[PDB]
Amino acid sequence: NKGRIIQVMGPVVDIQFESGQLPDIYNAITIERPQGGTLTVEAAVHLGDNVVRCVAMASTDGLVRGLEAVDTGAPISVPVGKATLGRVFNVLGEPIDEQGEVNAEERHPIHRPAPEFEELSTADEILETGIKVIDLLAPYAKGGKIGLFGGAGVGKTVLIQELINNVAQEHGGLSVFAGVGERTREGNDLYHEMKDSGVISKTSMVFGQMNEPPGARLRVALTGLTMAEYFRDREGQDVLLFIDNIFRFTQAGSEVSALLGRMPSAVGYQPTLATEMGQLQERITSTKKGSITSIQAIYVPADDYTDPAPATTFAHLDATTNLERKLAEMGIYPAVDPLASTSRILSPAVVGEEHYRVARGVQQVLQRYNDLQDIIAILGMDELSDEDKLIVARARKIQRFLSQPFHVAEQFTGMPGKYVPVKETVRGFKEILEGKHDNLPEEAFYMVGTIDEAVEKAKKL
């Protein structure tokens, strides 16, 4: 139960307990004294001689050797359920928004095994988002991990919010946002971004952020995850869970490992990169009660995606959404690259032959559009097959019918929002492909919902 601090070396604290009274690993041990608060460290290694080495979750300045420590008897446990919605927390499950304490009924440990083999759903299902381009071309699967590649100016957070909104909206799924290792300003910005887009009410936020020690950065996601795991397991819904910079997470992994004096890999990373990633990722899954679909922002400054850190994360991805600056400065405002984005559940097996064929249909057209693009570049529009010239017009319409007004954007544009069922997206693009709307003006597909809405607007200009 109680121990006394033997060593303090950075975020690493060595604590001697009494024989046979030693903490399971991952156990929150609280340390108090000597100037004010309460430091929480997490059991990491039993060094022997009843010493156990830990990682701090906050600064260990001022700690003094001998200070009493108390094994809480459980991993860092955090509030769950209704109580966490609209509230922002840190790793410890403490409210960092000065808004009261969380009147949560329960508090779950952030460390736990992934759902067992027989609890796993055995068939892929599309997580229907509002958005036409991701649903048609790069579908999210329930219990899926999606890599979101963006640059903020490409409206990554507007995407996040529409997602949160539309999943809350047309399913009943709440969301968790886990800010890991990024800019605290960016976190604050997003908070307000969605506090007056109203979306915050459907979300609990957890913040690590690059000012925090590595132990906090490393565990922060596990908190968000735990919170999302409630709404799946209790409440049985299809929860979201966004991790902003999951890459920062594996990099927090590296810092802590170094602090614990491990290997490390010849590229700097932990010996346990993959293991730790898997331990997080594997809990994000579609159980039989069904649920969690993680949208993970992956930045990595270096831009080498062959790097072990991105490599590992990618192993888990099931779809990638690619926010494109080019499309943004072009008007297409879910600025998702139709060609770059992909989903492993774009099988006819998952979305049916029709959807699949329409999508492979839209893809080839847009691809062809690029080929011809280079053709007229080097051969002029001279010698352009009437058909080729034709399937260029359908590309321009498709490219436009891939944009759509967001509910979250209402408060600026105000279109208002549009949620488009895949059933209707597929139909929509199927007609465009079949040539059922060549006659319509190309700016008539820009920012509409269903194809029905596009004829409505072919009656202007």
Partner: protein, 474 residues
């Protein structure tokens, strides 16, 4: 018999007082979790915890098992989903067997073997015709994430519904959900009756990922040394290598060449050297292995990839480009090979394919002249136009293994120009419907290939084709 933990960390433990444990002995912890005696340090044992490491702390007691690392083995496992220790994950009971095998055992000597000669039909047109796989062969399947490697193992496994061969899908570091999906697909194709699934998902302990292939291999070895035929697929020897590397300088082994240990090659070579084709003296059993390497950005020149390449007997490369062009399987027949070759390829296929290798080799060059059909009559729509046709019969839906016979007719059809008067958006259906026509009518020809299959009665073949030919619906 009984020792006790004195330091534990990162799943590695210094246990004391297991005086007579053997190197690599299976051990059981107070709480039922297993470990293995990794090192016999002078005055303590280095035990590697092989499961939930969390409730194992200092002072925890460890028991001897008296057994070197071993796994349940035998037909008792067909259809069960298991982890490398052989404990069931599908909740369908215990595994009722009494026959075991060491996860580490010797490979068949240079004298225990005979050259691969029996075909292992994958059912996949692209692979069974070019890149043909024999029994006892190690054929590498290498490609980026999401290029459909697993789908290829599944089709191949499914295609063993024929049933000379028992299949072991070993999933190393895959997402549990993906494996659960793989098991379900196997179920829906009635292919799980003859399939063992050994699995150590992404969240499992590294030593568990490390052992996975050696378990699945041991399971395959029981059958080979029995005289039967097994096919083992190690889904991600990449993930194993990394798993192994973690375990290494957790044990603080010196980092070696590249990010990996010095023995990372040995890790893999030791393993799929155990897949073999046994001499008749030794029973003629076989174990065939489809290792997977997962490349990043199609970097095939990387360390682990090049290693395994120099270990196996050929590799099937999966182009990422192809897969997002919807081309499936996304096989790159150009750079892809079977060193065993047509030795494991029935006479019929070995024939109709022979030409086909050349066929789209030529179509590779003239490919460049894509949407510019101008050269008229020369090396023109004679080569090019009929090359576009071949590439269509190579395409093939997921989970639709095609019986050799059907593959062979289908190939022979196009390769003998029976598609040339036919369109190109029309090749795929003309094949699907050519075969359905034979299965119900010209079965004489089909069964002729199922019996010492060389196809012959050609011209009768060409006639039989032409009596479906003439298009009548292009």
């Amino acid at each position: 018999e009984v020792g006790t933990v004195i330091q534990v960390g990162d799943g590695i433990a210094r246990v004391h007082g297991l005086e007579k444990v053997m190197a690599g002995e299976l051990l059981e912890f107070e709480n039922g979790v297993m470990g293995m005696a990794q090192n016999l340090e002078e005055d303590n044992v280095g035990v590697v915890i092989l499961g939930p490491y969390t409730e194992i702390r200092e002072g925890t007691q460890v028991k001897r098992t008296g057994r070197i690392m071993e796994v349940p083995v035998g037909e008792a496992l067909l259809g069960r989903v298991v982890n490398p220790l052989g404990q069931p994950l599908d909740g369908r009971g215990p595994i009722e067997t009494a026959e075991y095998r060491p996860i580490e055992s010797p490979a068949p000597g240079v004298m225990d073997r005979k050259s691969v000669h029996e075909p292992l039909q994958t059912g996949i047109k692209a692979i069974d015709s070019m890149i043909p796989i024999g029994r006892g062969q190690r054929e590498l399947i290498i490609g980026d994430r999401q290029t459909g490697k697993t789908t290829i193992a599944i089709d191949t496994i499914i295609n063993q519904k024929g049933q000379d061969v028992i299949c072991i899908y070993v999933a190393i570091g895959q997402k549990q959900s993906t494996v659960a999906g793989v098991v379900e697909t196997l179920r829906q194709h009635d292919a799980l009756d003859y399939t063992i699934v050994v699995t150590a998902s992404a969240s499992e302990p590294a030593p568990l990922l490390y052992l996975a292939p050696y378990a699945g291999c041991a399971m395959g070895e029981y059958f080979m040394y029995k005289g039967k035929h097994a096919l083992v697929v190690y889904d991600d020897l990449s993930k194993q290598a990394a798993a192994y590397r973690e375990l290494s300088l957790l044990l603080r082994r010196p980092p070696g060449r590249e990010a990996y240990p010095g023995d990372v090659f040995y890790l893999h070579s030791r393993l799929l050297e155990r897949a073999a084709k046994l001499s008749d003296e030794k029973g003629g059993g076989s174990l065939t292995a489809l290792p997977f390497i997962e490349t990043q950005a199609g970097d095939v020149s990387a360390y682990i990839p090049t290693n395994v390449i120099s270990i196996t007997d050929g590799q099937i490369f999966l182009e990422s480009d192809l897969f997002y062009s919807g081309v499936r399987p996304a096989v790159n027949v150009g750079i892809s090979v079977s060193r065993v070759g047509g030795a494991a390829q029935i006479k019929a296929m070995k024939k109709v394919a022979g030409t086909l290798r050349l066929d789209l080799a030529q179509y590779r060059e003239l490919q460049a002249f894509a949407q510019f059909g101008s050269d008229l009559d020369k090396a023109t729509q004679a080569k090019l136009n009929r090359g576009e046709r071949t590439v269509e019969i190579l395409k093939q839906d997921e989970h639709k293994p095609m019986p050799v016979e059907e593959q062979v007719i289908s190939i022979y059809a196009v390769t003998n120009g029976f598609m040339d008067d036919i369109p190109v958006e029309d090749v795929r259906r003309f094949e699907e419907e050519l075969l359905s026509f034979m299965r119900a009518n010209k079965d004489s020809l089909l069964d002729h290939i199922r019996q010492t299959g060389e196809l012959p009665d050609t011209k009768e073949l060409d006639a039989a084709i032409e009596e479906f030919k003439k298009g009548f619906t292009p």
